[PDB]
Coordinates of C-alpha atoms in Angstrom, one line a residue:
Chain A
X21 CA 0.0 0.1 0.0
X22 CA 2.8 2.5 0.3
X23 CA 4.6 1.5 -2.9
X24 CA 8.2 1.5 -1.0
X25 CA 10.5 -1.3 -0.3
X26 CA 13.7 -1.4 1.8
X27 CA 16.8 -2.7 0.3
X28 CA 19.4 -3.4 3.1
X29 CA 22.8 -4.6 1.6
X30 CA 25.7 -5.6 3.4
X31 CA 28.1 -4.2 1.1
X32 CA 26.9 -2.0 -1.8
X33 CA 30.6 -1.0 -2.9
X34 CA 31.1 -4.8 -3.7
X35 CA 30.1 -5.2 -7.2
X36 CA 28.2 -8.2 -6.6
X37 CA 25.6 -6.5 -4.2
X38 CA 25.8 -3.4 -6.7
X39 CA 24.5 -5.7 -9.6
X40 CA 21.9 -7.3 -7.0
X41 CA 20.6 -3.9 -6.3
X42 CA 20.2 -3.1 -10.1
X43 CA 18.1 -6.2 -10.5
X44 CA 15.9 -5.1 -7.2
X45 CA 15.5 -1.6 -8.6
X46 CA 14.8 -2.5 -12.2
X47 CA 12.0 -5.0 -11.1
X48 CA 10.6 -2.4 -8.6
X49 CA 10.5 0.4 -11.1
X50 CA 8.7 -1.8 -13.6
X51 CA 5.9 -2.5 -10.8
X52 CA 5.8 0.8 -9.6
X53 CA 7.5 0.6 -6.4
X54 CA 10.4 2.8 -4.8
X55 CA 13.4 1.5 -3.2
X56 CA 14.9 2.8 -0.2
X57 CA 18.5 2.1 0.1
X58 CA 20.8 1.4 3.3
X59 CA 24.5 0.0 3.4
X60 CA 25.8 -1.5 6.3
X61 CA 29.3 -2.3 5.4
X62 CA 28.8 -5.8 7.1
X63 CA 27.9 -4.2 10.5
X64 CA 25.2 -6.0 12.3
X65 CA 24.4 -3.0 14.3
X66 CA 23.8 -0.9 11.4
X67 CA 21.9 -3.7 9.9
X68 CA 19.5 -3.8 12.8
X69 CA 19.2 0.0 12.7
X70 CA 18.4 0.0 9.0
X71 CA 15.4 -2.7 9.7
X72 CA 14.2 -0.6 12.3
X73 CA 14.3 3.0 10.6
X74 CA 12.7 1.2 7.4
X75 CA 10.1 -0.2 9.5
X76 CA 9.0 2.9 11.2
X77 CA 8.9 4.3 7.7
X78 CA 6.6 1.7 6.8
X79 CA 8.0 0.2 3.5
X80 CA 5.8 -2.7 2.5
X81 CA 8.7 -5.1 2.6
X82 CA 12.2 -5.6 3.0
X83 CA 15.0 -7.3 0.7
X84 CA 17.9 -8.0 2.9
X85 CA 21.4 -8.9 2.1
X86 CA 22.4 -10.1 5.6
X87 CA 25.5 -9.2 7.4
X88 CA 27.4 -11.9 9.3
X89 CA 25.8 -12.1 12.9
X90 CA 22.4 -13.3 14.6
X91 CA 19.3 -12.5 12.9
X92 CA 16.7 -13.7 15.5
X93 CA 15.8 -10.0 16.3
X94 CA 14.0 -10.4 13.2
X95 CA 11.7 -12.8 14.2
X96 CA 11.1 -11.1 17.6
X97 CA 11.0 -7.4 16.6
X98 CA 8.8 -7.3 13.5
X99 CA 5.4 -8.3 13.2
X100 CA 5.1 -12.0 11.5
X101 CA 2.8 -10.4 8.3
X102 CA 6.1 -8.0 7.7
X103 CA 7.5 -9.8 4.2
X104 CA 11.3 -10.3 4.3
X105 CA 13.2 -11.8 1.6
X106 CA 17.1 -12.6 2.0
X107 CA 19.6 -12.6 -1.1
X108 CA 22.7 -14.4 -1.1
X109 CA 22.6 -15.6 2.5
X110 CA 19.5 -17.3 3.9
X111 CA 17.9 -16.2 7.3
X112 CA 16.2 -19.1 8.4
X113 CA 13.3 -17.5 10.0
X114 CA 10.0 -18.9 9.4
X115 CA 8.3 -17.0 6.8
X116 CA 11.3 -15.3 5.3
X117 CA 12.0 -15.9 1.6
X118 CA 15.3 -16.4 0.2
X119 CA 16.9 -16.2 -3.4
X120 CA 20.4 -18.0 -3.2
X121 CA 22.7 -19.3 -5.7
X122 CA 23.7 -23.0 -6.3
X123 CA 26.9 -22.6 -4.5
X124 CA 27.9 -26.5 -4.0
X125 CA 27.4 -27.1 -7.6
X126 CA 29.3 -24.4 -9.0
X127 CA 32.1 -25.0 -6.5
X128 CA 32.3 -28.8 -7.5
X129 CA 32.2 -27.9 -11.2
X130 CA 35.1 -25.3 -10.8
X131 CA 37.2 -28.0 -8.7
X132 CA 36.6 -30.9 -11.0
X133 CA 37.8 -28.6 -14.0
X134 CA 41.1 -28.1 -12.0
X135 CA 41.2 -31.8 -11.3
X136 CA 40.8 -32.5 -15.0
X137 CA 43.7 -30.2 -15.6
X138 CA 45.8 -32.5 -13.4
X139 CA 45.8 -30.9 -9.9
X140 CA 46.0 -33.2 -7.1
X141 CA 47.1 -30.6 -4.4
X142 CA 44.0 -28.3 -4.2
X143 CA 43.2 -25.8 -1.6
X144 CA 40.4 -23.0 -1.0
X145 CA 40.4 -19.8 0.5
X146 CA 36.8 -18.6 1.6
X147 CA 35.7 -15.7 3.5
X148 CA 34.3 -15.7 7.0
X149 CA 34.0 -19.5 7.9
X150 CA 30.6 -19.1 9.5
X151 CA 28.6 -17.8 6.3
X152 CA 26.3 -19.9 4.3
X153 CA 28.3 -19.1 1.3
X154 CA 31.7 -20.1 2.5
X155 CA 30.1 -23.1 4.0
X156 CA 28.4 -24.4 0.9
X157 CA 31.4 -23.4 -1.4
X158 CA 33.6 -25.3 0.7
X159 CA 31.4 -28.3 0.7
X160 CA 31.2 -28.4 -3.4
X161 CA 35.3 -28.3 -2.8
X162 CA 35.2 -31.4 -0.6
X163 CA 32.5 -33.4 -2.7
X164 CA 34.6 -32.8 -5.6
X165 CA 37.9 -33.9 -4.2
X166 CA 36.2 -37.0 -2.6
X167 CA 34.6 -38.2 -5.8
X168 CA 38.1 -38.2 -7.6
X169 CA 39.6 -39.7 -4.6
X170 CA 41.9 -36.8 -3.9
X171 CA 42.7 -36.4 -0.1
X172 CA 42.4 -32.7 1.3
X173 CA 44.8 -31.6 4.1
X174 CA 43.1 -28.9 6.2
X175 CA 46.2 -27.1 5.9
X176 CA 44.9 -26.2 2.4
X177 CA 41.8 -24.5 3.7
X178 CA 41.7 -20.8 5.0
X179 CA 38.6 -18.9 5.9
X180 CA 40.3 -10.4 1.8
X181 CA 42.1 -13.9 2.7
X182 CA 45.4 -12.5 1.6
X183 CA 46.7 -13.8 5.0
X184 CA 44.8 -16.9 4.7
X185 CA 46.0 -17.6 1.1
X186 CA 49.9 -16.5 2.1
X187 CA 49.3 -19.4 5.0
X188 CA 48.1 -22.2 2.9
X189 CA 50.6 -21.4 0.3
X190 CA 53.9 -21.3 2.4
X191 CA 52.8 -24.7 3.6
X192 CA 53.1 -29.6 0.5
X193 CA 51.6 -26.1 -0.8
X194 CA 48.7 -26.6 -3.4
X195 CA 49.0 -26.0 -6.9
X196 CA 45.6 -25.0 -7.4
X197 CA 42.9 -22.9 -5.3
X198 CA 39.5 -22.3 -5.3
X199 CA 38.5 -18.9 -4.3
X200 CA 35.0 -18.0 -3.2
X201 CA 34.6 -14.9 -4.4
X202 CA 36.5 -12.1 -6.4
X203 CA 37.3 -10.1 -3.5
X204 CA 39.2 -13.2 -1.7
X205 CA 40.3 -13.8 -5.6
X206 CA 42.2 -10.4 -5.1
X207 CA 43.5 -11.4 -1.7
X208 CA 45.1 -14.6 -3.2
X209 CA 46.5 -12.7 -6.1
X210 CA 48.1 -10.3 -3.5
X211 CA 49.5 -13.4 -1.5
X212 CA 51.1 -15.0 -4.8
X213 CA 53.1 -11.8 -5.1
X214 CA 54.0 -11.7 -1.5
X215 CA 55.2 -15.0 -1.8
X216 CA 57.3 -14.4 -5.1
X217 CA 54.7 -17.1 -6.6
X218 CA 53.1 -17.3 -10.1
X219 CA 49.9 -17.3 -10.9
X220 CA 49.7 -19.8 -13.6
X221 CA 52.6 -22.0 -13.3
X222 CA 53.1 -22.0 -9.6
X223 CA 49.3 -21.6 -8.8
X224 CA 46.1 -22.0 -10.7
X225 CA 43.1 -20.5 -9.4
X226 CA 39.2 -20.8 -10.1
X227 CA 37.0 -18.0 -8.4
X228 CA 33.3 -17.2 -8.0
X229 CA 32.2 -14.0 -9.6
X230 CA 32.5 -13.0 -13.4
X231 CA 34.5 -10.0 -13.4
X232 CA 36.4 -8.8 -16.8
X233 CA 39.6 -8.3 -15.5
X234 CA 39.7 -12.1 -14.8
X235 CA 40.1 -12.6 -18.5
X236 CA 43.2 -10.4 -18.8
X237 CA 45.4 -12.8 -17.1
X238 CA 47.3 -15.7 -18.5
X239 CA 46.1 -18.1 -18.4
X240 CA 42.3 -16.5 -18.1
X241 CA 40.9 -17.2 -14.6
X242 CA 38.3 -19.4 -14.9
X243 CA 34.8 -18.5 -13.0
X244 CA 31.7 -19.3 -11.6
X245 CA 29.3 -16.6 -12.6
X246 CA 26.3 -15.8 -10.5
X247 CA 23.3 -14.5 -11.9
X248 CA 23.5 -11.3 -9.7
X249 CA 20.9 -9.4 -11.5
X250 CA 18.3 -12.1 -11.6
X251 CA 18.9 -12.6 -7.7
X252 CA 17.9 -9.1 -7.2
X253 CA 14.9 -9.3 -9.9
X254 CA 13.5 -12.6 -8.4
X255 CA 13.8 -11.2 -4.7
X256 CA 11.8 -8.3 -5.7
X257 CA 9.4 -10.4 -7.5
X258 CA 8.9 -12.8 -4.4
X259 CA 8.7 -9.8 -2.2
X260 CA 5.9 -8.4 -4.3
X261 CA 3.9 -11.5 -4.1
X262 CA 4.1 -11.5 -0.6
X263 CA 3.2 -7.9 -0.3
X264 CA 0.1 -8.1 -2.6
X265 CA -0.7 -11.5 -1.4
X266 CA -0.6 -13.2 -4.5
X267 CA 2.4 -15.6 -3.8
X268 CA 4.4 -17.1 -0.6
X269 CA 7.9 -16.9 0.6
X270 CA 10.2 -19.6 -0.6
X271 CA 13.9 -20.7 -1.1
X272 CA 15.0 -20.4 -4.4
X273 CA 18.1 -21.5 -5.9
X274 CA 19.3 -19.8 -9.2
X275 CA 21.7 -21.4 -11.7
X276 CA 25.2 -20.7 -11.9
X277 CA 27.4 -20.9 -15.0
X278 CA 30.9 -22.0 -15.3
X279 CA 32.8 -19.6 -17.7
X280 CA 36.5 -21.1 -18.7
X281 CA 37.0 -18.3 -21.5
Chain B
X1 CA 10.8 18.1 6.2
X2 CA 10.3 14.6 5.1
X3 CA 14.0 13.6 5.9
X4 CA 14.0 11.6 2.4
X5 CA 16.6 12.4 -0.4
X6 CA 16.3 11.2 -4.0
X7 CA 19.7 9.4 -5.3
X8 CA 19.7 8.8 -9.1
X9 CA 22.7 7.3 -10.5
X10 CA 23.9 6.7 -13.9
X11 CA 25.1 3.4 -13.4
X12 CA 24.9 1.6 -9.9
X13 CA 26.9 -1.6 -11.3
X14 CA 29.7 0.6 -12.1
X15 CA 31.7 0.6 -8.8
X16 CA 32.6 4.2 -9.2
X17 CA 28.7 5.1 -8.3
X18 CA 28.4 2.2 -5.8
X19 CA 31.2 3.7 -3.6
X20 CA 29.4 7.4 -4.2
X21 CA 26.1 6.0 -3.2
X22 CA 27.9 4.4 0.1
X23 CA 29.2 8.0 1.1
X24 CA 25.7 9.4 0.2
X25 CA 24.0 6.9 2.3
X26 CA 26.5 7.1 5.3
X27 CA 26.1 10.8 5.4
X28 CA 22.4 10.7 5.3
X29 CA 22.3 8.2 7.9
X30 CA 24.5 10.2 10.3
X31 CA 22.0 13.0 9.8
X32 CA 18.5 10.8 9.9
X33 CA 17.9 11.0 6.2
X34 CA 16.7 8.3 4.2
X35 CA 17.8 7.8 0.4
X36 CA 15.5 6.5 -2.3
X37 CA 17.4 4.9 -5.1
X38 CA 17.0 5.0 -8.6
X39 CA 19.2 3.7 -11.5
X40 CA 19.1 4.8 -14.8
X41 CA 21.5 2.8 -16.8
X42 CA 22.9 6.0 -18.8
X43 CA 19.3 6.4 -20.3
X44 CA 18.1 10.2 -19.8
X45 CA 14.1 9.3 -20.3
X46 CA 14.7 7.1 -17.3
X47 CA 16.6 9.8 -15.5
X48 CA 13.7 12.3 -16.2
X49 CA 11.3 9.9 -14.9
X50 CA 13.2 9.0 -11.7
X51 CA 13.4 12.7 -11.1
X52 CA 9.4 13.3 -11.7
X53 CA 8.8 10.1 -9.6
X54 CA 11.2 11.6 -6.6
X55 CA 9.9 15.1 -6.8
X56 CA 5.9 13.6 -6.7
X57 CA 7.1 11.5 -3.6
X58 CA 8.3 15.1 -2.3
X59 CA 11.9 14.1 -1.2
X60 CA 13.6 17.0 0.3
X61 CA 16.1 17.2 -2.4
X62 CA 18.1 15.2 -5.1
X63 CA 21.8 14.1 -5.5
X64 CA 22.1 13.3 -9.2
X65 CA 24.8 11.7 -11.1
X66 CA 23.8 12.7 -14.8
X67 CA 23.2 10.6 -17.6
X68 CA 24.3 12.2 -20.9
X69 CA 21.9 14.3 -22.4
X70 CA 20.1 17.8 -22.0
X71 CA 19.1 18.7 -18.4
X72 CA 17.2 22.1 -19.2
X73 CA 14.0 20.2 -18.0
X74 CA 15.3 20.4 -14.6
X75 CA 15.5 24.2 -14.7
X76 CA 11.8 24.2 -16.2
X77 CA 10.0 21.4 -14.5
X78 CA 11.2 22.0 -10.9
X79 CA 10.7 24.8 -8.6
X80 CA 13.5 26.9 -8.2
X81 CA 13.5 26.1 -4.5
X82 CA 14.0 22.5 -5.1
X83 CA 17.7 21.7 -4.1
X84 CA 19.9 19.5 -6.5
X85 CA 23.3 18.7 -6.3
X86 CA 25.2 16.8 -9.0
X87 CA 27.9 14.3 -8.9
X88 CA 30.9 13.6 -11.2
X89 CA 29.2 15.7 -13.9
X90 CA 28.2 19.1 -13.5
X91 CA 24.7 20.3 -14.4
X92 CA 25.2 23.7 -15.4
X93 CA 22.0 25.0 -14.0
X94 CA 21.8 28.1 -11.8
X95 CA 21.3 27.1 -8.3
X96 CA 22.3 23.4 -8.6
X97 CA 25.8 22.5 -6.6
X98 CA 28.4 20.1 -7.8
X99 CA 30.7 17.8 -6.2
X100 CA 33.4 17.0 -8.8
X101 CA 37.1 15.7 -9.1
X102 CA 40.0 17.5 -10.2
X103 CA 40.2 15.8 -13.6
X104 CA 42.5 18.2 -15.3
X105 CA 45.2 17.9 -12.4
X106 CA 45.1 14.2 -12.1
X107 CA 45.4 13.6 -15.8
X108 CA 48.2 15.7 -16.3
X109 CA 50.2 14.2 -13.3
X110 CA 49.2 10.6 -15.0
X111 CA 50.7 11.7 -18.5
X112 CA 53.6 13.5 -16.8
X113 CA 54.4 10.1 -15.1
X114 CA 54.4 8.5 -18.6
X115 CA 56.6 11.2 -20.1
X116 CA 59.3 10.9 -17.4
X117 CA 59.5 7.2 -18.3
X118 CA 60.5 8.0 -21.6
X119 CA 57.1 7.8 -23.6
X120 CA 56.9 10.2 -26.5
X121 CA 54.0 8.5 -28.5
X122 CA 51.5 9.0 -26.3
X123 CA 47.7 8.6 -26.7
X124 CA 44.3 8.9 -24.6
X125 CA 41.0 6.7 -24.7
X126 CA 38.3 8.7 -23.2
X127 CA 34.6 7.9 -22.9
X128 CA 31.7 9.8 -24.8
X129 CA 33.2 12.8 -26.3
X130 CA 30.8 15.2 -25.0
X131 CA 31.2 14.6 -21.3
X132 CA 32.6 17.0 -18.6
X133 CA 34.9 14.1 -17.2
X134 CA 36.1 13.0 -20.8
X135 CA 36.6 16.6 -21.9
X136 CA 38.8 17.8 -18.8
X137 CA 40.6 14.1 -18.6
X138 CA 41.8 15.1 -22.2
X139 CA 42.3 18.6 -21.5
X140 CA 44.8 17.5 -18.5
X141 CA 46.5 15.1 -21.4
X142 CA 47.0 17.9 -23.8
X143 CA 48.5 20.1 -21.1
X144 CA 51.2 17.8 -20.1
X145 CA 52.1 16.9 -23.8
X146 CA 52.2 20.6 -24.3
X147 CA 54.5 21.5 -21.4
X148 CA 56.8 18.6 -22.7
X149 CA 56.9 19.9 -25.9
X150 CA 56.0 16.7 -27.1
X151 CA 53.3 16.8 -30.2
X152 CA 50.2 15.1 -30.3
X153 CA 48.5 13.2 -33.2
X154 CA 44.7 13.5 -33.1
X155 CA 44.9 9.9 -34.4
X156 CA 46.1 9.1 -31.1
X157 CA 42.9 10.3 -29.3
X158 CA 39.6 8.1 -29.0
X159 CA 36.3 8.8 -27.5
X160 CA 34.3 0.4 -23.1
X161 CA 36.3 1.9 -25.7
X162 CA 37.9 -1.4 -27.0
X163 CA 37.1 -0.3 -30.6
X164 CA 38.4 3.0 -29.9
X165 CA 41.7 1.4 -28.6
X166 CA 41.9 -1.0 -31.1
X167 CA 41.9 2.2 -33.6
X168 CA 44.3 4.1 -32.0
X169 CA 46.7 1.3 -31.6
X170 CA 46.5 0.2 -35.2
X171 CA 47.7 3.4 -36.7
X172 CA 52.9 5.6 -35.7
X173 CA 51.0 4.1 -32.8
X174 CA 51.4 5.3 -29.1
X175 CA 53.5 3.4 -26.7
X176 CA 51.3 4.5 -23.8
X177 CA 47.7 5.4 -23.3
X178 CA 46.0 7.4 -20.7
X179 CA 42.7 6.0 -20.2
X180 CA 39.9 7.8 -18.5
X181 CA 38.2 5.2 -16.3
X182 CA 38.4 1.5 -15.1
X183 CA 35.7 0.6 -17.5
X184 CA 37.6 2.2 -20.5
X185 CA 41.1 0.4 -19.3
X186 CA 39.3 -2.9 -19.7
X187 CA 38.5 -2.2 -23.2
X188 CA 42.2 -1.0 -23.8
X189 CA 43.0 -4.3 -22.3
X190 CA 40.7 -6.0 -24.4
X191 CA 42.4 -4.4 -27.4
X192 CA 45.6 -5.0 -26.7
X193 CA 45.1 -8.9 -26.9
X194 CA 42.8 -8.5 -30.0
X195 CA 45.8 -6.8 -31.8
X196 CA 48.3 -9.2 -30.1
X197 CA 50.1 -6.5 -28.2
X198 CA 51.6 -6.6 -25.0
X199 CA 50.5 -4.9 -21.9
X200 CA 53.7 -3.2 -20.6
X201 CA 56.7 -3.8 -23.4
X202 CA 54.3 -2.7 -26.4
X203 CA 52.0 -0.2 -24.5
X204 CA 51.8 1.1 -21.4
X205 CA 48.5 2.4 -19.3
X206 CA 47.8 5.1 -16.6
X207 CA 44.0 4.8 -15.6
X208 CA 41.7 6.9 -13.4
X209 CA 39.9 4.6 -10.7
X210 CA 42.0 2.6 -8.3
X211 CA 40.9 -1.0 -8.4
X212 CA 42.7 -3.7 -6.7
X213 CA 43.1 -5.7 -10.1
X214 CA 45.5 -3.0 -11.6
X215 CA 48.0 -3.9 -9.2
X216 CA 48.4 -7.4 -10.2
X217 CA 49.6 -6.4 -13.6
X218 CA 53.2 -6.5 -14.4
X219 CA 54.0 -3.6 -14.2
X220 CA 51.4 -2.3 -12.1
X221 CA 49.0 -0.1 -13.7
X222 CA 49.3 3.5 -12.4
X223 CA 46.2 5.0 -11.5
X224 CA 44.6 8.3 -10.4
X225 CA 42.5 7.4 -7.4
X226 CA 39.1 9.4 -7.2
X227 CA 37.7 10.2 -3.8
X228 CA 34.4 8.4 -4.4
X229 CA 33.2 8.1 -0.8
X230 CA 33.9 11.5 0.0
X231 CA 32.4 12.8 -3.5
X232 CA 29.1 11.0 -2.2
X233 CA 29.4 12.5 1.6
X234 CA 29.9 15.8 0.5
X235 CA 27.2 15.8 -2.0
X236 CA 25.0 14.6 0.7
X237 CA 26.3 17.4 3.0
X238 CA 25.7 20.3 0.7
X239 CA 22.4 19.0 -0.4
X240 CA 21.5 18.7 3.5
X241 CA 22.6 22.6 4.0
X242 CA 20.7 23.4 1.0
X243 CA 17.5 21.6 2.5
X244 CA 17.7 23.1 6.1
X245 CA 18.6 26.4 4.9
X246 CA 22.2 26.5 6.7
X247 CA 24.4 26.6 3.6
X248 CA 24.7 27.3 -0.4
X249 CA 24.9 25.3 -3.4
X250 CA 28.6 25.3 -4.8
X251 CA 31.0 23.8 -7.1
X252 CA 33.3 21.6 -5.1
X253 CA 36.4 20.2 -6.5
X254 CA 38.0 17.1 -4.8
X255 CA 41.7 15.9 -4.4
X256 CA 42.5 13.2 -6.5
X257 CA 45.8 11.2 -5.7
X258 CA 48.3 9.6 -8.3
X259 CA 49.2 5.9 -7.2
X260 CA 52.1 4.2 -8.8
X261 CA 52.1 1.2 -6.6

């Protein structure tokens, strides 16, 4: 009834979220909704403040890219009729929708690709260990390695992640890494030349997130592309259904695609 | 009096604008304003629709990253008392504030660096020829060349820019290029290997925008860093003054810094 929706993002400066936001804004606009923006910069205290601020302003609903931390307040501080849909990371709160990527499958595909190239010492640098995304991407890694009968040393796993990369690469160090996002891939690239190692001959990398600069390297960095704008567009579509009473909250898993270039 | 401000951005998916939006949102929040977001994707017809949409919702004012096109409709379709501050590109409408970078200075500094390295065949790939940013970044280039007594062939100038790069680099082609943003730098990188040329020994590059990937290259790509967050914060600060009657619209030029890595 107000035709305003609240979009709260954990990091607008990260291009993943910016493109999610573009899909949200494009859908809302096509349907005649306005979009209130808040950026939390991964601070849960700010996320809570924006939730309360957006609620008091009586937005019709919230699209939330959650920051790392507890989200129980959402279930006790808000009416059960206030529609929320999460992107990227799930809430695990009854009634809250989620639009999420197929992380397990994408990671398993990326790592198989490395295995098919002849890597056996393969590691993984992920972001914060507690996240749904880190957890599922790590899981895909383990499943690929397991199916190939390749053992995985825990010292090969780390949770920018430059320091993590630097630690796993100064170990029987891996010849290959799965990185869980473009920003971690940045930190891995920083670790290589901190350690004097050579992207390519010394270490190969498969990453999530399809950034143009990854294609400029030699070899081109293979990536798992996430359907960022579609995540945004579908969250807004599910939020609108919830608001106008034409549909339910659900967990939607969207396809990723492996790009080898 | 509503405590809502309209942020209209020409391309939220471009990291430049995402970081400006971040600065705007952080300053609005600190002052108890909310931010409605529109993304135009560089379409002036969408810009005008957002402006009208935001005005009818009675936002207190607008921060506008202008899309290329005519902006006189601002001056005729809005009350003179409606505060507007532009970022990145100026409006040239009486009463509208602007928060811009020091484009001439930063470009001259980057090109002088190339000249101090021993480049004499130096070109420039800029974005759309009309824009204030392209115009000023080109001017800085010419002033550096001039001061060094190095002649510039027009055919070294092009206004992604992959095609423009491909064109200037298949000419007495330059050994170095100024590129006017990270997105143009992507197109020049694309051109290099379309042409079979080598970043480095064949063509060097200085760019605006400080992206982490630029430092992974060999050599590292020197950049003119823009104060993106501060541009957003100050544009919001100016706009708030204008709304609460505590200050005036003006043109602010913000310091950029040259990063060689």
